[PDB]
Amino acid sequence: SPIRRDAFSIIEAEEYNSTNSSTLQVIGTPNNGRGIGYIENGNTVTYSNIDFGSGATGFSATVATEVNTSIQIRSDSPTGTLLGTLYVSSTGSWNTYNTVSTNISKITGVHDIVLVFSGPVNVDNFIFSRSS
Ligand SMILES: O[C@@H]1[C@@H](O)[C@H](O[C@@H]2CO[C@@H](O[C@@H]3CO[C@@H](O)[C@H](O)[C@H]3O)[C@H](O)[C@H]2O)OC[C@H]1O
Ligand SMILES: [Ca+2]
Ligand code: NA
């Protein structure tokens, strides 16, 4: 998976750098893309060296789930700074993807990102939004 990436271009969830998960799989999507799924509560997924430049204050992910769930977005490590939490309610199916966004604290420079899952969700991709 890429050693580094831009926060303001699409990051593919399936191109993660490490995970604690023993269940997570790379899945396909209806339009023949890929994502991550078979995720459980407590699973973490790390993406290395994301460059936030002069600042990001939002996070958007394209996700599908049948259960209400949340994803913490942390900087640097699973116990690093909580940037924000994306709350995802049911999208209607494991294959019905929806772009969902949340606010985060402003982050600058280069940091690993860790997504921390409280339950099952399929994630295709994500991206950050710049501060004003
Ligand atoms: O070709 C694509 C298929 O591979 C794709 O299959 C889906 C893959 O993800 C599955 O989602 C899991 C369902 O079970 C939950 O408990 C897990 O947490 C989910 O990750 C989904 O159910 C499959 O249908 O579908 C799209 C096809 O184009
Ligand atoms: Ca993807
Ligand atoms: Na394992």
From Swiss-Prot:
Entire-sequence positions represented here: 242 to 373 of 651
UniProt domain comment: XynA is a modular enzyme. The number of CBM6 (carbohydrate binding type-6) domains varies between strains. The polymeric substrate can interact with several of these CBM6 domains.
Chain residues that bind D-xylotriose 1: T29, Y38, N95, N122
Binding-site list for Ca(2+) 1: E12, E14, R34, D124
Record domain CBM6: where: 9-129
Protein task: Endoxylanase that degrades arabinoxylan and glucuronoxylan to xylobiose and xylotriose (in vitro).
Regulation: induction: Up-regulated by growth on xylan.
Name of the molecule in the record: Endo-1,4-beta-xylanase A
Annotated family: Belongs to the glycosyl hydrolase 11 (cellulase G) family.
Protein location: Secreted
Binding of D-xylobiose, residues: Y38, N95, N122
Superkingdom of source: Bacteria
Sequence repeat start-end pairs: 37-98
